[PDB]
Design a binder for this molecule. Structure first.
Ligand SMILES: N[C@@H](CCCC[NH3+])C(=O)O
Ligand SMILES: CC[C@H](C)[C@H](N)C(=O)O
Ligand SMILES: [Ca+2]
Ligand SMILES: [Ca+2]
Ligand SMILES: [Ca+2]
Ligand SMILES: [Ca+2]
Ligand SMILES: [Ca+2]
Ligand SMILES: [Zn+2]
Length: 316
């Protein structure tokens, strides 16, 4: 909508207060005009028809329980845009400031979120397995990173290229969580998963096997479920990325860590310059080696740590 940019206030899914960029034209809309061609948040009204209605509010205050997922989807989309722009000099998911759209209150008791090729979609959860999924910044950045992958490498969503697709979204989800510096960790979804149970999460990057996911190529899943295990075998690449950043000894192989910033630079370059739609894990290794080489030198510690990490998880 056309109108005047302003700033509202609301409460997110976890009860924290925050300011959000809105647009005023009779109503106050969840339209952020300060970032590219805009961040737009929609109400799907418990249906599955998308996008739904642009979120409209009478007084620019968003403290109703029904508002909370909209507040976080809108706010965390902005934070993710800021991450890509300030850290990687990328303007939105397509590199030319495409509008970012999200719908919340999708369906009833829907325990998931997703990028559908054009927009983000967030369920409310059933209140036991999940609370509303936009409450997790790593979840939002995960979904939006899918859009980045779709416009760059284009990894097909099955078998090893799908696992890489998934791992990239967990990696940049986590890096966005560290960038915002709100209780950062190497777990996925801990803020919105199982409100009854502390200390757990959907997946772990530091120790994928905590929840049954492979942490070594020899344990990869070879069946047909989950599009050939795209959310399972991602654990192999997530562990590798954890090792590159933090270091550690894994199946007898020691890796010197180089830190989060360099991890991000290497995987961003690998994604945007070297990976293709059918890249497999072995091709990812070569892309990350070449990326580190480009950035730091063939004899750098950085190239050495990338090699050590993939050796540790058994990717040749
Ligand atoms: N997002 C992943 C894991 C969450 C599962 C939620 N029930 C998937 O769809 O497989
Ligand atoms: C990133 C967590 C969410 C649930 C995602 N759609 C899966 O995995
Ligand atoms: Ca903001
Ligand atoms: Ca209001
Ligand atoms: Ca966290
Ligand atoms: Ca996390
Ligand atoms: Ca929990
Ligand atoms: Zn995903």
């Amino acid at each position: 909508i056309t109108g005047t940019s302003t700033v509202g206030v609301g409460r997110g899914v976890l009860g924290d207060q925050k300011n959000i960029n809105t647009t005023y034209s009779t109503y106050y809309y969840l339209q952020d005009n300060t970032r590219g061609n805009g961040i737009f948040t929609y109400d799907a009204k418990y249906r599955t028809t998308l996008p739904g209605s642009l979120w409209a509010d009478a007084d620019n205050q968003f403290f109703a329980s029904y508002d909370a997922p909209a507040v976080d989807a809108h706010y965390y989309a902005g934070v993710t845009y800021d991450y890509y722009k300030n850290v990687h000099n990328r303007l939105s998911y397509d590199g030319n400031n495409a509008a970012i759209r999200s719908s919340v209150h999708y369906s009833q008791g829907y325990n998931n979120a997703f990028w559908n090729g054009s927009q983000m979609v967030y369920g409310d959860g059933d209140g036991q397995t999940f609370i509303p999924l936009s409450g997790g910044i790593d979840v939002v950045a995960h979904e939006l990173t899918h859009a980045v992958t779709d416009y760059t490498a284009g990894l097909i969503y099955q078998n090893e290229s799908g696992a890489i697709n998934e791992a990239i979204s967990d990696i940049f989800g986590t890096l966005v969580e560290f960038y915002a510096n709100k209780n950062p960790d190497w777990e996925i979804g801990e803020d919105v998963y199982t409100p009854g149970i502390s200390g757990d999460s959907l997946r772990s990057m530091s120790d994928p096997a905590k929840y049954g996911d492979p942490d070594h190529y020899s344990k990869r899943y070879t069946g047909t479920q989950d599009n050939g295990g795209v959310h399972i075998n991602s654990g192999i690449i997530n562990k590798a990325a954890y090792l590159i950043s933090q270091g550690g000894t894994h199946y007898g192989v020691s890796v010197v860590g180089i830190g989060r910033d360099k991890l991000g630079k290497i995987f961003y370059r690998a994604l945007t310059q070297y990976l293709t739609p059918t890249s497999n894990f072995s091709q990812l290794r070569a892309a990350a080696v070449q990326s580190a080489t480009d950035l730091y030198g063939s004899t750098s510690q950085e190239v050495a740590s990338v090699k050590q990490a993939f050796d540790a998880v058994g990717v040749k």
